[PDB]
Amino acid sequence: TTPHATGSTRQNGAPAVSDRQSLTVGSEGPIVLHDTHLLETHQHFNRMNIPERRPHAKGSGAFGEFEVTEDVSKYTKALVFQPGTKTETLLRFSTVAGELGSPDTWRDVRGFALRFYTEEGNYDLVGNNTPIFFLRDPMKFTHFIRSQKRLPDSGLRDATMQWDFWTNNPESAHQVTYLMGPRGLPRTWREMNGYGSHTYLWVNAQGEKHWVKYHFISQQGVHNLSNDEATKIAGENADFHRQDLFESIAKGDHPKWDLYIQAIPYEEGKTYRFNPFDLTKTISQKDYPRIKVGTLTLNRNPENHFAQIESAAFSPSNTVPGIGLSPDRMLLGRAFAYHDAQLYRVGAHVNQLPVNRPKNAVHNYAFEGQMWYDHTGDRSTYVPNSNGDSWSDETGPVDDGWEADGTLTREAQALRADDDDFGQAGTLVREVFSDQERDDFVETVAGALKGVRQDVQARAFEYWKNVDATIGQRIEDEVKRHEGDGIPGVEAGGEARI
Amino acid sequence: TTPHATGSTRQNGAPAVSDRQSLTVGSEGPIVLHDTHLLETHQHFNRMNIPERRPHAKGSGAFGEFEVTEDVSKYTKALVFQPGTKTETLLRFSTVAGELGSPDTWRDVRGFALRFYTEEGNYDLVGNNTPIFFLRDPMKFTHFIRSQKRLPDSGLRDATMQWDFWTNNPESAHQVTYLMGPRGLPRTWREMNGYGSHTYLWVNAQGEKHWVKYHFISQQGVHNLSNDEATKIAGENADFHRQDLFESIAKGDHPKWDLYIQAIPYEEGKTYRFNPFDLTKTISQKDYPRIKVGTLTLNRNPENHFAQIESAAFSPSNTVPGIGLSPDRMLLGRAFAYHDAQLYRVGAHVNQLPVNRPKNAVHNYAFEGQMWYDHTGDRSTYVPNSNGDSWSDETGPVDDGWEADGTLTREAQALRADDDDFGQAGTLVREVFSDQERDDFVETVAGALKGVRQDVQARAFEYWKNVDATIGQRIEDEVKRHEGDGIPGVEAGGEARI
Amino acid sequence: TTPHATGSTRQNGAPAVSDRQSLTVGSEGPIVLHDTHLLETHQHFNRMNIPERRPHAKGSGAFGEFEVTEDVSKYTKALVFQPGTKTETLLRFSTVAGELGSPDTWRDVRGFALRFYTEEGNYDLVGNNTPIFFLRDPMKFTHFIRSQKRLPDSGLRDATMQWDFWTNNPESAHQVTYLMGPRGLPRTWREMNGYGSHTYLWVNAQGEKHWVKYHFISQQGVHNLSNDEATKIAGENADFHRQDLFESIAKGDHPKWDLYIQAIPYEEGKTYRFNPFDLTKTISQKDYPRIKVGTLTLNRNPENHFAQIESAAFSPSNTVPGIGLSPDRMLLGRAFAYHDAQLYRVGAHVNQLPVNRPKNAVHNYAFEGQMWYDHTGDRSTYVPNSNGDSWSDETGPVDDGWEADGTLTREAQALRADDDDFGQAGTLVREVFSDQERDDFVETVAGALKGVRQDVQARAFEYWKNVDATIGQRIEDEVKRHEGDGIPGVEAGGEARI
Amino acid sequence: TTPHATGSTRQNGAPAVSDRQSLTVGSEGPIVLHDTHLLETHQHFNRMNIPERRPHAKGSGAFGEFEVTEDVSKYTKALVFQPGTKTETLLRFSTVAGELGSPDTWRDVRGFALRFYTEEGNYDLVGNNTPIFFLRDPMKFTHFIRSQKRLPDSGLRDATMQWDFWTNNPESAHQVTYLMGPRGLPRTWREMNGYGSHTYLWVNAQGEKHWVKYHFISQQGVHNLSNDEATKIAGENADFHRQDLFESIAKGDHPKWDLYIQAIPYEEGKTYRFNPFDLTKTISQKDYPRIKVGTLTLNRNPENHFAQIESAAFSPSNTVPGIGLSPDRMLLGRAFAYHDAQLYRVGAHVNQLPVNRPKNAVHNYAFEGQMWYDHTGDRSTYVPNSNGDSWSDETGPVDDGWEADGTLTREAQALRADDDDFGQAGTLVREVFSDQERDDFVETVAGALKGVRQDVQARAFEYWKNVDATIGQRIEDEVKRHEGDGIPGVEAGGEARI
């Protein structure tokens, strides 16, 4: 390359001389302090690792395209969803509880984090493989995730801790049912569905509002593993899902999902018999049918997993005109939490990394900070200014809001006509599952309760009977026989657990 | 507790009001920005995770005691090793390559990181479960560990990458042989040996020097798993070793190790037929027999894994009077690398956390920094000073050094009479292993090579024949039949690997 | 100390050998990499500095006591303010705009950050030396502080930037008037008043609410410097105020302030003719007289400025039972902003440092994180739990809240009968100032406008005439003559400014 | 810009709606948690500040060009210094002790940090405005800089602390003399000289070595301020030097310096009568005359001070082929210290920021880490590899080294024939200074000693008499009369100092 090149450089671009031997006083002498290549390479090595995500540490993803094939402009003005629009995407899939090195095939929720690189900013639909969640207020989320992780003394996951939390938070029943059913163990990420879970707001060009749910239905179908199959794979190939996705795309097999929405008129949000602002509820498709939007295709692997996947930073706060948040307390907490975490995990300038940069021009009032790659030159740092550096100042009601009235309180959401903690779980068990899925569900839940401390087991029997009397008694009977499946990723009992 | 108590507090000690519901405008309204308990708890949640160690992320440990039962005062003045001395200890065990959530029973080196809380400072013997390592110069260490981790695009571990590195760094053969043998898969941490690996310096009260090796021989014996058993356990119980140690201690079964040293007179370090400063070499016990020192017992579990184990920060730089480093280049690099990493991983004041604090008084010229818990009051910040705040100023040759002479160079260490890359590996295969261990070794190495890119396989056949002609041909034959064990933690081949 | 002691230790407690010479190969040879004392001391030196506060970087403080001498229990149940109560305090004083090394005697607001170490938590009254501020919505605060700091290209403070911001944000007029008056240059921190500025909520034992203002009236009186005196001191003694406070306390002269409150009945908050929730307004003492509470005395210097002052972390979120926030948007933003900044500035565990620790027991649901000094042992990490580890779950309206009703909006606060941007500023100029203070005010404002770009000057003449026609014309006349005082800390004009 | 644009964006590129009002429940209601623009802008504001440099916090700079106008190829092969070569440069000037906001015109050393963006990497000559320094071993540097900063309790600079350190470290006398002379107060950065201070190694194309000193002689001459003038300016314009440089360049007045070297043959380094490896010594120009190299011109201001100046990261480790370090212990410590500090101050990827990026291609074995902007794709992470990703492996003696022989020691450097602590200082006072400069020097040193604790004063009288008997007695006489200049930036005495 250069006249004095050696095959590699230091960080300043000068030849490095050797990537294989340190600088010593003769062959037998000590290493000198001024081996600057040894220092730079080791100091960087020592700073490669970054905090893993909490939750959703273990995951991978791919790039692709979304194509709108229907007309939903009467519901939203968002550029990404206008007729015919094609938009580049990034999708990261993940588990929830396990850490960076944990097996892909533990029983768990899966993440479905989808970025659209739109012409009006990065739009992130940060979803999961379920339409609901375990909780309806974000104050509980910290407790839930800690209960899914490790005991403070022994450092082991513990089903007693998990069930102690779930049984004492009965709002969890709908999603625990989903988790313990077939879909707790996707065969591949290509063979699971994605969902927004929350109600979001869509706003059309005239300002009319609808409450919407997102459903990404896999064109590869929904295919799952048994507990025993998933345990075997966890030992044989801890990266089975990561490998599957990369190999599939490398061979030219590009997985697809069709996006559908449900759309509730603004005024009906307040009156519907299930609370659309309660993340533990689904909305009936008889009442609000699915409406097709378009198709997502994944077609391109990362070239650098760490820079393009590990360093990606998704957030529900990354809305675009035509799409807003909703009165769902969980979503409102998420609006804060992701960006906050990313400032620590990645850095203040996380959104300047290529994968997080929008396609359109950023004109944002933020300056300085560590690792400021793309600076603002001599632009004004304040507003209004007399130097022609524009700012925003729209006054009055926003286009993507709603109304509220009351005293400051900490209390449960008011119940709609058909709201409770157990009924939708019961519909899932009784009406949605097949007989074989119910049989497997009993083996799963009974196994998940094996070795759990008996006080917690007794509460779990009541919890499951509240879901469904028959399933609850079947579970109790099997637990009392000390039978049930091993659950990949967690157990109970012994001197190192509760 | 207090007149207005609610059951828990915020970070300022005031009652928190609720750990279960956020502060909203009426039951149905949005969360307010000034829910300071929601903010504090989520912002802390978002900062719980710290960078995992690189390497040795996955591990656990226990506290105990070392008791000296022999007299080695003619070799060292170190307080911890004087006759009859009992000293509190902490031992962290670990794998090497896998991340925080990876299975305990992957094939790998194990760490054996032992702190002695001595009356003259914390003395750390940061060992492994092998007396040797893969490399003899720290410039190569970064490359080696990266080769043991993941491919840059797909994020998969890859045996092709591992073997490409090993075959191109034939100094690795002694330790690769040990790793691929029985001891690559300890049954429990209680049933493996520990070693310092490096030569260290011991200095007696009169200033005489000896070069020493440390050997911690388990009183529970050395017991290992087959590849197939370890794979099965990796799926069924990713924390098998962590659980075993905690349960053992909880039941009152306290594991023990007997410490022995080898002691080489100072002048013989330069002349010995194997280089004692080459980390790829063992020293013959016929030439330098083992000398008993005393016994290590583990007897107490952590009460908080994260604060006492994850936040522990060991370093070979933590020598005490009577114990020094040596001309081993690897050890000299380690003297820098651990403390450096810990400043990033934990923080500038890592050594003020309780687990890292010495028992004796610290009087160190370091002030200020983030998270400064134990400040120095009005003590002088400079030396010499006229205010009675003491300092050190010993001049001339140190008590724990050695000589050097030469020009600044980057080159391999000079060979002693019997030094090479393959001979000690060959003794291990031919003379130490049993017939059954050799049979299993062939199945292990052949399995480890299954699916590896053929150029790299061909280099590996030559590497193994250089270790031993017979074993190398047996391995080659089996690889050419496409037979061999699955290796827990890594594979080769397919569209997502080299 | 120890048998092998040398006068100081390394971080592990072992003797350091020398604080004065590095470890070299002979007297003439290179420094070796394994000079671990050189490495530890330099790596700590390189991590001593922490981000300075933004704003309020330049400051110092002292400890003391608050004594309640009146009965205000009909207004608040807070333990700190019950009859006869004595509470330890910490007070940090500061400027606003200048950085860590800037002169104490620049013209500026001064901070008055007061912690009470109460028996129900740390209560922080984070005040200033003025009862008002420049702004009424926190979205503008970032812009304001940046406008008070440096131009993006040249790195100079610039009065053109300052006035461009102020004139385009006429809500600033009340506080700009106060700043440009006598009190912009306190002689000492002992000779200025402190104020909460915001309306806070006080809640009594029966739950009745009052809106309150805090006033700390110096027993040393209010004494100020001229611009010329303060400029001279800025050159001669950049730490004049820091030195004054430390010397005063060292000699036994303990400064005092008497605390008074104004108390507005809950329902009158909504109806009062000035908006008590607008930080740009004072509340008439004819309408709501001052009510004495007690006396603050400072009596003890820090022993370590960095650990006790620089590392102190105050926050308006640190309320205690009996004291809450208010509908003032600025205060609601502050509830978030301080703790957030401190996580970056100091660390996640900022509130475990001794100066930030409460006196009462903390029982908070936060675990792990870097630099975790005081761990929670095996306490449950989730709620509810079946292990006897308590939590909070009060449901329904909080005791320290209020009501709201409307659509989500971004707009100015509604005007009360007597609200505007200029009238209270005009009362200050016309009715409060003396003739000599008005003369000096003209010289100050005219000087502050010298060299300012003419478009901005023209807007400033209109701004000042809106405050008071007479003062505005006097200022304009003097600016058009190119006369006025030099203002310590800032100027305008030349090729490096707007 | 976009169909729904508002004048500015959030960090994701979506319209921000307002930079001036927060999102509230009606005009009178609270701010909602999901005001994501308020959150992003405040969280960034709270992370703008970065640790200031230690030392050399206060500074500024400009870009320019170096032009070689002579032929020094017989001494170096470095591309930047070959005949006729023109290279872009960046120069940052600074004080040493004061913090980010301190006045530019305090008495102090000035930095002269010069980067050349060469075709073989960034070459940094990190100099000062003096050819010598206070110390000859880096172990003392931490102590020295702390002694130049603030007392641990009161937070004041203290001349007693400064002189306690200097008098107890008599190696300081040469540079203290220079500092206390005329050049302690440059009028502008344009009117001071720059120096490398250390001996560096130059290596020619044939491998022959010379020891070199760098001298940058200002074409604007050397012009200084009196103590009284500099004190006055410190109050009136704390940024006088920063402003001067920016204004000069903005008007088209481009300051210049001529670079000269001294060149000592390799073998004469060992024998010269002053130790060229002792940073407290100059080398006689009668013995080794200055040899012209070329001319530096500054011609371009930053467009963004923070990104281009504050975030610049210079290091003596940034050598290029043809230029190496030397046996000077101070320089060898600097090889480690700068890069280390920058990892904390700026970040692991500091050298990827535009100002720190080389012009030539970087091919460095470092991957991952926070804020990784320019990733390496699928490049191999290890060496040797079988994938065509090059590395370095030069073996044997380096081209830019030297010899050493001895035992590991901590001791002073051996004295050459003419080495001592006081003689060169004495030549400066007696032979270099004029009568008026000597008169001013007495007033400066006597002023610097005013109020210093008497034990330290007595040691200072002996120190100055050792420099020169006459000057020392003149200083003592004046100190005993309680006369001398005020010294800008520091004083002694009173209850807040020693």
Ligand code: HEM
């Ligand atoms: C062993 C002694 C020394 C050590 C350990 C040392 C260390 C440091 C460190 C850590 C910094 C801050 C770097 C950063 O954060 O970017 C610094 C800055 C600086 N030092 Fe040194 N220093 C020493 C001696 C010297 C000498 C002798 C000179 C000149 C010949 C010098 C000139 C400078 C300059 C000019 C800067 C500021 C660079 C800039 O403008 O960014 N230092 N020093």
